[PDB]
Amino acid sequence: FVKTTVDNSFVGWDMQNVITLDTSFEDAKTQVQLKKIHSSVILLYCSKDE
C-alpha cells in the first residue's frame, strides 16, 4: 500500500533501504542491515515488544 501511494503521487518521495529484518536481533545480518540506513526519518511496523 505504501508503494502504491508513493508511486501515483504528484509530490515525489525518495525511498531507499526497505529493510525486512528477521534473523534473531543481534546476529550479524541485522547489524549491517540497520547500519545501511543513513537518511533521517524512520517508519517501523512491529508488535510492541519487537
Added chain:
Amino acid sequence: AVLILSEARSLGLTGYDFFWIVPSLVSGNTELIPKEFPSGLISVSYDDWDY
C-alpha cells in the same frame, strides 16, 4: 587481538570488503595462528625465511 577479532566478527565488521592491518608483534612466530584470524590479513614483519 583474539578477543577483539572474536567480538568484531559477531558485529559484522569482518566482511568481503574489510582490510585489517596489524603490527609485527601480533604475528609472534608465524607458527601458532589461532582460529579467529580472518583470511587476508596484512601484517608487516621481519624476515626469517631468507637471510
